[PDB]
Subunit: 260 residues, 4 copies
Amino acid sequence: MKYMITSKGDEKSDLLRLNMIAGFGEYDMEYDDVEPEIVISIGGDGTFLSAFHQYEERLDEIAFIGIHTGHLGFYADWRPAEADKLVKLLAKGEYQKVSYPLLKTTVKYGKEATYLALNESTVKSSGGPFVVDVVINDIHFERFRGDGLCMSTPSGTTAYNKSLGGALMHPSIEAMQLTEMASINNRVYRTIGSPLVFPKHHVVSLQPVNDKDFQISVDHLSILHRDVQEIRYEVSAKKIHFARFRSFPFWRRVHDSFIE
Amino acid sequence: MKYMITSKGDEKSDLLRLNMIAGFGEYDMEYDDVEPEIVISIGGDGTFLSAFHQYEERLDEIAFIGIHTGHLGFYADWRPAEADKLVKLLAKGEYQKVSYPLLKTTVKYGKEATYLALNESTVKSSGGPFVVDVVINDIHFERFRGDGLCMSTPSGTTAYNKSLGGALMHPSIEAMQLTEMASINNRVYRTIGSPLVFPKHHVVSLQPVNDKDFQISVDHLSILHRDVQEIRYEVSAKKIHFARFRSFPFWRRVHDSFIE
Amino acid sequence: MKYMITSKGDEKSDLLRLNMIAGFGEYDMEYDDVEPEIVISIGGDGTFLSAFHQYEERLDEIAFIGIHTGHLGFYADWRPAEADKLVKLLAKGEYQKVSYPLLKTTVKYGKEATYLALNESTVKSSGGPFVVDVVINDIHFERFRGDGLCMSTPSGTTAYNKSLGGALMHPSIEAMQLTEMASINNRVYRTIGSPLVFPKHHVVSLQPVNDKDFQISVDHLSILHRDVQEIRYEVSAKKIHFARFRSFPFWRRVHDSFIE
Amino acid sequence: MKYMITSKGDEKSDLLRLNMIAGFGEYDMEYDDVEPEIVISIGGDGTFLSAFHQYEERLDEIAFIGIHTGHLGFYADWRPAEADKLVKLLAKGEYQKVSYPLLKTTVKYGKEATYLALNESTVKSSGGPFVVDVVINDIHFERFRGDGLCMSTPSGTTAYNKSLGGALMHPSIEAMQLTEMASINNRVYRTIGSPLVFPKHHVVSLQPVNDKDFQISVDHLSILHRDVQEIRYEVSAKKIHFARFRSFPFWRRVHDSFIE
Ligand SMILES: Nc1ncnc2c1nc(Br)n2CCCCO
Ligand SMILES: Nc1ncnc2c1nc(Br)n2CCCCO
Ligand SMILES: Nc1ncnc2c1nc(Br)n2CCCCO
Ligand SMILES: Nc1ncnc2c1nc(Br)n2CCCCO
């Protein structure tokens, strides 16, 4: 089928890419980076994220694969020594696919911009104090005061979510998790404190109180949005598809990255 | 149908019980506390828990209802002023039912004892140091050192789970959440720290390292178990059923209890 | 003596200022905002902070006083109804003074800039990843990876420090407290996690690893510093002096602000 | 002078004790475990704690020394390979001494019992719910609801205090730190959450609300006290004295134990 390979750009990653291409040349495979069916990332999780966002509009047409040249990653979870055996089983096809949920972020202005996040989306102030009203399924839940908020995907919970006290969530759970960043709690400002986990079809919207300018991040991309009326979060109907090469459980991946 | 009513035992709760019984006497309803179809709890969440455990073996035959005479509860979420309108719509039937997931706890000895928890199950030491190996789906995840662990249901996340930094989880999510209690982390002992959320059919087992005696709690019940070989957790195949009286969302329930 | 009064600028604060000035006119007191001996702040804690920084170079010549027109503050801790009795005992003099410790921040470039903080000083990245080596009394303590760090004064622990999990410290303790902001901890990056409390004459220096540009805050002032070689923290030899009007304990102040 | 040596009791520790005694026999030193001037602990921090509590009544007459046969400890901070050079400089004397603060715990009944803690003192319930009123310098600060409380010494902050989110405090600071254990916080029960650090001469007293039986720990010793009227904490006027063998800073000790 059609395939393509992105590289971190350093020496080891570029050479592993060329060796896999040459190996692919021994099969009924053609290199197409416009309409690929297989997208291979070589580098780290960040390299995988860029590969994800390069092909956001063809997610249901692509099975992704990640190779880590550095330390183990949660998306780049195959060692370089498995590249040759990766090429062989990829070329035959007949492999299984696994799907992770994604987070949809909609921003409303005085038009409307929608983004897809594989890890998380964060909202911070543009300089002054960050204050938003949190509305869950149209009911006002809290007035949040602090540094900002973070809405994470399941597989994103091992990233920024984890640093903010969030729980680690198995990616087979179609959910999204919201965590707080340095919240103020006194007798006048009150926040839940606890991380919140939302199921599918629940809608979490952030609404400004004073300043309508916010710094909004979506994975690597961080952009200052102005005259924002609403930021609403929900589990996306779209999913990312991975090619299943062998058994590498999420919890084993979690153990290897944080325990030993 | 057959119904019964439990009471906290104080003055207000006993009188509300007798008024509802008299009101029920105006309908095709008979009081049976052996094989009831409707179980009404009057008091607090603790009163509801006891009502739950009184009828553990007939969960799929019973729709529970909670009335709080004191402050609002997460299971006893109807005010006493709604008792008369509760009696009327209960007697007709034709009401909707909602179901929450439950946690199954299995304890193995050198026989085997199984329990059902509506909120959570905790494991602590019997006096000395608490040390267990945590095994997830047969792979060794961590050696936990500290005060103990807590495995919570979705609806249980607003109880003890919340106090231990756990996330709040919508009860429509079939999952269980594991949190740590005062864990030791140095260069030799390592724990994940983060709360873990497990989907259905994932099995979390605790295995002793030195002492085989543990203080095991299941909701209100706390029992010292001796010569324990294994404690394994998993989302139960059984569910608790609530009679749906009107719209009282979980997140609104969360807001009322903790925010305002 | 010479005195001056700053105001939040809103209606209630300007009117309370004019009433206190008129009351002061009934005594041997002259209004001098160049070399005042008494500085009265009317508004909130932020109004007090600006009053503090307006007169940084004459701290040992000035006894500060804070009046809150809004909610209670930790520096503006006198109600407006006490203004007339404040004017009277201030004009006589013979009052007691209390002193709080201050934090000295030194920034080194490829000259050198020194600041005094009443609450805290924070260091964040300029956009990319924030990475610094933490050096305590010339020994390398940790390589910090995350959002940033916060070094707080004792009286500053009830502000930003508190939101980051820091401890609340009685201001009679000559110390400074360092807290982490969303730190990364895996098998390769390690941080202490815990807040650190340093005594007098201990020096904490932050040293860049890659990017030498940092966003440095000192109370309200937040400035982007470029080509930074070192940021070193230590308890200042200077102290802020408050005029003691009656008994308002720090722990009572803490209770009123956060408990009830 | 008079000296004695305690041992963990395992093989390596008993043999190191006998070698140091034989080495001491080459000097003007006599073994007295009744009125020793030097107390050497061989094993771990727990071995040092028992050595501390064996000689509580002669603290100002004794300079303690800790040797770790296992991993590094905060009190047993000298390697076994330094035993021979330890014996030599100990026998001459003329060494420097360093002093750490201690925590005094007073328990009142319906007589009165006082204890000295080197690490911390914890209070938990005897089975049911733990509820106490917290009174600071005679003013009521909070009604605490949860698992329990922990009052730590400076050098004790690296133990249990650290696991409960407490700050790490340099032992030259004469202070005590109070942390919470799994506290309940809703709209009706309120706690400060943050750890509290108290200076010398501040008195923190715990007072029962319902149950007057509490499980009180002081370092290793944990005892069930009945009919308790009050538990009050304060920094002790007594201090533990260490013999200063060379430069081993607390922060270096902290780095070695938790970072690398
Ligand atoms: N999903 C993930 N889980 C754990 N680490 C991840 C991650 N995605 C990325 Br990119 N990283 C590493 C950089 C950010 C670290 O906070
Ligand atoms: N599910 C729940 N959510 C919040 N509170 C609950 C609860 N169940 C019970 Br009983 N309570 C109150 C007593 C325990 C408080 O920690
Ligand atoms: N020292 C302090 N303690 C508690 N609140 C303070 C404070 N100084 C200021 Br300004 N504030 C309020 C604004 C910042 C809130 O985080
Ligand atoms: N002061 C201390 N600092 C760090 N560890 C200590 C300690 N005292 C003891 Br005993 N230990 C180890 C056992 C308890 C671990 O929580």
